[PDB]
Design an enzyme around this catalytic site. Structure first.
Site, mmCIF file in Angstrom:
data_model
loop_
_atom_site.group_PDB
_atom_site.id
_atom_site.type_symbol
_atom_site.label_atom_id
_atom_site.label_comp_id
_atom_site.label_asym_id
_atom_site.label_seq_id
_atom_site.Cartn_x
_atom_site.Cartn_y
_atom_site.Cartn_z
ATOM 1 N N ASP A 175 10.935 142.844 13.699
ATOM 2 C CA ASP A 175 10.036 143.926 14.040
ATOM 3 C C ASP A 175 8.665 143.323 14.315
ATOM 4 O OD1 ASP A 175 12.040 145.837 13.449
ATOM 5 O OD2 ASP A 175 10.794 146.911 12.019
ATOM 6 N N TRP A 205 10.187 144.320 22.505
ATOM 7 C CA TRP A 205 9.500 145.538 22.892
ATOM 8 C C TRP A 205 10.181 146.130 24.109
ATOM 9 C CZ3 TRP A 205 6.706 148.811 20.266
ATOM 10 C CH2 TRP A 205 6.097 149.860 20.935
ATOM 11 N N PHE A 206 10.798 147.283 23.891
ATOM 12 C CA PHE A 206 11.391 148.078 24.950
ATOM 13 C C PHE A 206 10.442 149.235 25.132
ATOM 14 C CE2 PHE A 206 16.242 147.106 25.058
ATOM 15 C CZ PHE A 206 15.967 145.757 25.232
ATOM 16 N N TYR A 210 0.525 145.896 18.031
ATOM 17 C CA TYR A 210 1.707 145.038 18.101
ATOM 18 C C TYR A 210 1.558 143.811 18.949
ATOM 19 C CZ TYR A 210 4.621 147.926 15.083
ATOM 20 O OH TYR A 210 5.123 148.571 14.008
ATOM 21 N N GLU A 212 18.249 147.322 6.792
ATOM 22 C CA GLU A 212 17.281 147.609 7.846
ATOM 23 C C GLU A 212 17.506 146.696 9.016
ATOM 24 O OE1 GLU A 212 15.428 149.966 8.137
ATOM 25 O OE2 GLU A 212 14.405 150.619 6.336
ATOM 26 N N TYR A 225 15.315 137.594 14.595
ATOM 27 C CA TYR A 225 14.611 138.784 15.093
ATOM 28 C C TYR A 225 13.621 139.333 14.048
ATOM 29 C CZ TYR A 225 13.253 143.460 16.266
ATOM 30 O OH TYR A 225 12.513 144.608 16.457
ATOM 31 N N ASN A 257 7.462 144.909 7.171
ATOM 32 C CA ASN A 257 7.502 146.296 7.668
ATOM 33 C C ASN A 257 6.205 147.053 7.359
ATOM 34 O OD1 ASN A 257 8.569 148.992 8.562
ATOM 35 N ND2 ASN A 257 8.962 149.296 6.368
#
Ligand SMILES: O=c1ccn([C@@H]2O[C@H](COP(=O)(O)OP(=O)(O)O)[C@@H](O)[C@H]2O)c(=O)[nH]1
Ligand SMILES: NC(=[NH2+])NCCC[C@H](N)C(=O)O
EC number: 2.4.1.-
Length: 303
Positions: free
Chosen positions: A200, A26-27, A49, A232, A198, A299
């Site tokens: 999402d 999370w940026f 999230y 993706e 990683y 997703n």
């Protein structure tokens, strides 16, 4: 199986066992829309999230879970994460600024002037003057704008999704050895130059992932709707630090003016490496590189 073949070349299946940490990221552009003692990670109804990782971490209490964070964070917001780390001690919060990326970096002065030279060295009657004159104005703008300005520095927080999709790719390059490089506790169980997975924040763990096998130890999310197959960035799983396919992508980033992490680094890096000369279809690569797991509802932000 034990392997899979692509472009006539053969590729063994490589293990990613339950040691292998899940990475989320999370940026956050605007930390101040959060409470200064709130975990500066979003948990809205549409995007709960902060909730999706915890449940991930609960479903996997015995593999490490990294939260790759970055943003101008208040002391109290850093301790919201701190509580988060002791209240669940497989979770490891990692600040982007606590990692050194200098070994993967480059100056746009260098990068531009390179291409300026390449183009000027070609026939005038062949050559892309339209591009030749753009890289020089880019050049003209960076000089004025700043001399010592780099690739890494450019893909900044001001730059939208590039900010976090660029550093993602860097993270994976550093892989599991980055838990060590920021100094995070109880990570001695991670293997050296070891991979990661990683995700999402919206790819939902439901059940356990177990031990993954990949072609050369790499796979990425592939979306397939209704019939339009793409690659993706929303899953990226490697079996080691500095995987070649992504390494090649970092080179393309170095060797292209205006490289894009999605178009160039991720997509062409993977595929040039897996298929340098384009002998298999795009889709037939998408299939070959697809990351399959039934225990993730992939997703969920599209809904
Ligand atoms: O402000 C943001 C927005 C997105 N992301 C990253 O983008 C990923 C996927 O974003 P999402 O599914 O919300 O958008 P999509 O790309 O699917 O439109 C998230 O898990 C984050 O890692 C982030 O770091 N900061
Ligand atoms: N890597 C990813 N899963 N990216 C997200 C693609 C889906 C996107 N939310 C949509 O509107 O369809």
């Amino acid at each position: 199986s034990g392997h899979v073949s692509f472009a006539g070349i053969d590729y063994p299946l490589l293990p990613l066992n339950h040691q292998t940490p899940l990475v989320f990221q999370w940026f956050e552009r605007n930390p101040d829309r959060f409470g200064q003692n709130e975990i500066p990670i979003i948990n809205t109804q549409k995007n709960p999230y902060l909730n999706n990782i915890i449940n991930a971490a609960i479903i996997e209490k015995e593999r490490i879970i990294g939260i790759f964070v970055d943003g101008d964070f208040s002391k109290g917001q850093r301790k919201a994460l701190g509580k988060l780390e002791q209240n669940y001690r497989n979770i490891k919060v990692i600040y982007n600024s606590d990692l050194n990326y200098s070994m993967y970096d480059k100056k746009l002065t260098t990068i531009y002037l390179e291409n300026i030279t390449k183009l000027e060295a070609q026939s005038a009657s062949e050559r892309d003057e339209v591009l030749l004159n753009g890289v020089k104005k880019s050049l003209e703008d960076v000089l004025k704008n700043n001399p010592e300005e780099t690739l890494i520095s450019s893909h900044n927080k001001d730059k939208g999704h590039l900010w976090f999709d660029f550093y993602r790719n860097l993270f994976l390059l550093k892989g599991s050895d980055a838990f060590l490089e920021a100094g995070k506790p109880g990570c001695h169980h991670l293997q050296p130059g070891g991979g990661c997975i990683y995700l999402d924040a919206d790819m939902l763990l439901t059940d356990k992932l177990g031990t993954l096998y990949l072609p050369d130890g790499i796979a990425i999310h592939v979306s397939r709707k209704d019939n339009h197959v793409s690659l993706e960035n929303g899953i990226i799983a490697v079996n080691r630090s500095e995987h070649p396919a992504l390494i090649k992508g970092l080179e393309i980033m170095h060797s292209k003016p205006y490289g894009d992490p999605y178009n160039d680094w991720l997509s062409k890096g993977l595929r040039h490496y897996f298929d340098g000369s384009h002998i298999q279809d795009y889709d037939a690569f998408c299939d070959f590189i697809e990351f399959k797991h039934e225990n993730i509802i992939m997703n969920t932000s599209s809904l």
